[PDB]
Amino acid sequence: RRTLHKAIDTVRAINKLREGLGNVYIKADKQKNGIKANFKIRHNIEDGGVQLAYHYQQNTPIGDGPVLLPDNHYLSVQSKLSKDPNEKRDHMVLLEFVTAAKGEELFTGVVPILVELDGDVNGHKFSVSGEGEGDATYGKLTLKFICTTGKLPVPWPTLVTTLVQCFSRYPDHMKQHDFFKSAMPEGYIQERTIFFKDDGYYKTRAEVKFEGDTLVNRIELKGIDFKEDGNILGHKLEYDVTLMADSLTEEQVSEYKEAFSLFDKDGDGQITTKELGTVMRSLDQNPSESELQDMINEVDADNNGTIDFPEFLTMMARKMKDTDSEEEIREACKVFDRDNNGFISAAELRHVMTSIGEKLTDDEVDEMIREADQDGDGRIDYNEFVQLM
Ligand SMILES: [Ca+2]
Ligand SMILES: [Ca+2]
Ligand SMILES: [Ca+2]
Ligand SMILES: [Ca+2]
């Protein structure tokens, strides 16, 4: 019958922009005079499930020169994997939008990118070449990769992380922490272990430095102890437009559009800083304009200063156990149980719906309460609430 979903999906959309969308944690490695980093990637498998890829990373400077040593922060990447319809070689088209929350001078403007990788995965050797450009200023990368040794023995999505964090847009306010540009042009060495759960592991040594106009990324990859018809060598992973981002049912994309339109009250198909701010205000939270722009900048890939529904879907569809799709809907309870008594009342349920921009009769408040209320009491409890997933 009922979609309170739009109300919850509305609150949900606010907690995600606030909590913030960044998936790659960067700690400094004083000792090795560079950076360390750990992160998961959840590759979707055809016929159900996700193939976990545990990432371990250390980058150290090549150059003798000085180098910036950061406080703990996050990088957020959104990826968009494609095929070139004309291209008939094994290839991948990557588009990336990457942001964080002396060598800087080199990344102002549009630098072209060469990428070159040598793999040995259970003695299945292969090479990949990369052409394209990076605009660090807007955090955008374009790249086309080609397997120059025939058919790639591993799925392209598993090579994405291995195939240039010096293109991450570090906002001016944080320019102090951009280790990767600071390292250039001498460059940096980026070493990783990538552990594929219940399967083998990649071992990468890459060096990232300028050769003239172009930022070059050169990679030896060794792939050890892989199950030979497991998910990697056995090619069992959905290509997926995104790395690290999921699908949604017809029922979810509808409710999400409905929630989107509670922010986008003018119907221009765009949420502005003011549009977002009114809704937040409505639910007794008064963010600053500066926070509102930071919040939008998170999902504003095309740098037009507004969230369109596509940008909103991508945020709402972030992976599955980002932390837990539960922890998140438990975090919604707070907003709805305004008195804090441990229950969301018909009164409270009204107050919210009203605030967010739902017109409703008092016979419809009552319907939602009964629709949600397993225990008979005329109140939704935090379990009753998360139950109505
Ligand atoms: Ca609008
Ligand atoms: Ca936009
Ligand atoms: Ca209450
Ligand atoms: Ca109840």
Numbering used by the authors: 1 to 101, 122 to 183, 187 to 412
What does the paper say about this structure?
Synthetic GFP chromophore in neutral water solution has an absorption maximum at 370 nm and an absorption maximum at 470–500 nm in GFP-like fluorescent proteins has been observed due to the surrounding amino acid environment inside the protein.
To understand the structural basis underlying FGCaMP functioning and to search for potential mutation hotspots, we determined the crystal structure of the original FGCaMP calcium indicator in its Ca2+-bound state at 3.2 Å resolution. The cpEGFP moiety contains 11 β-strands forming a β-barrel with chromophore formed by TYG184-186 buried inside the barrel. CaM includes 8 α-helixes organized into four calcium-binding motifs (EF1–EF4). The M13-like peptide is tightly bound to the complex CaM-4 Ca2+. According to the structural data analysis, we mutated the amino acid residues of FGCaMP located on the β-barrel of cpEGFP (N23, F39, I41, V77, S79, V180, T181, Q213, R215), on CaM (M267), and on linker 2 (L266), which were within 3.4–4.8 Å of the chromophore and which potentially affect the ratio of protonated and anionic forms of FGCaMP. Based on the crystal structure analysis, we found positions that stabilize the anionic form of FGCaMP and which potentially may serve as hotspots for further mutation of GFP-like FP-based GECIs.
